[PDB]
Amino acid sequence: NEALCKKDGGVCSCNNNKNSVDCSSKKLTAIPSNIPADTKKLDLQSNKLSSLPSKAFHRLTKLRLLYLNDNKLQTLPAGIFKELKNLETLWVTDNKLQALPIGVFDQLVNLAELRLDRNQLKSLPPRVFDSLTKLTYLSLGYNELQSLPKGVFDKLTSLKELRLYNNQLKRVPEGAFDKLTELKTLKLDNNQLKRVPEGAFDSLEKLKMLQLQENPWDCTCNGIIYMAKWLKKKADEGLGGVDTAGCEKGGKAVLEITEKDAASDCVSPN
Structure with a gap:
């Protein structure tokens, strides 16, 4: 039997009136198991969680914010977040995630912000973001992505910010941003893009900030x-x-480039 809150002998600080449990930075190796199901904000960032038991948040129906950033997760059990139907923000940044379970975000219908930067992501499930209707902020920076699944964004029709910077993108898909009509910030700097397909940006009216630096754009064709x-x-x-x-x-x-210097239908570095 281990008390959760410092006030009761535990190591995590707790705000009763605000239903928040802050277990951030307590060198933890396991999720405390007696977190009131009443909890709206859970903070487990900056600890040492190498795994994560399924059903770990399956009582926490009222969770609104969940910060799992900066631990040692190498994997996520298929249904960790199937019960958090009221979650609004989820951070699983700074970890060693090497893949995302095919329907891990199917139940997050109220999600508004999702960060997954600085992990070991190599691919994304074809429909991983399909339920993030209300989603407005998406960052996937700092991973090992080389390409994106066609349509991965199609359902994200409220997205305001999308960060794909700092990966190893060789090419963006055919009509990857066509449904992001409300996008205002698009970060794609630092990848291995030589160019984008024709019409790749036609739907991005209302777009305000575009980051394209650190890519080998070949204006030589x-x-x-x-x-x-x-x-x-x-x-x-x-x-x-x-x-x-x-x-x-x-x-x-x-x-500045015109059709003068790029008049030659030929193939990028081979």
């Missing part, structure tokens, strides 16, 4: 023309970031 025409047409409208896309070789900004 058409295929970059769509992105140049678009960016240039967006520079005027006061986009922001339009200048961050820079040529791999040319030195000059993709923005």
Whole structure:
């Protein structure tokens, strides 16, 4: 029998009137097992959790915020979050996650913010984000992603910010952002993109910040023309970031490129 709250002898600090349990930074190796099912905010960030028992949050029906960032999770049991139907924010950043269970987010219908940066993600399940209707903030930065599953975003029609920076993206899918009509910030800097497919940004009206730096854009062949025409047409409208896309070789900004220097339908570095 171990008391949860410091006031009762435990190590985690607890705010009764606010229904919050703060077990953050107590060198923990296991989820305390006597967390009131009444809890709205659970903080387990900055501890040493290498695994995580399923059904660990399956009584916590009222959970609104769950911070699992900065532990040692290498995996997530298939149904850890199937009961958190009122969760609004989930952070599982800074861990060693190497994959995400196919329907791990199927029950999070009220989710608004989801961070998964700095993990070991190599691929995403085809429909992992399909239930995140109300989702407005998505960051997947700092992982080992090389490509994205076609349609992975289609259901996210309220997304405001999307961060795919700091991965190893070789190419963005066909119509990956077509349904993100309400997107205002798109971060894609630091990947291995040579260009984006034609029309890749046509739905992003209402877009305010675009981060494209640190990518090997080859303005040495058409295929970059769509992105140049678009960016240039967006520079005027006061986009922001339009200048961050820079040529791999040319030195000059993709923005400036015309069909003159990129008039040759040929294939990026082989």
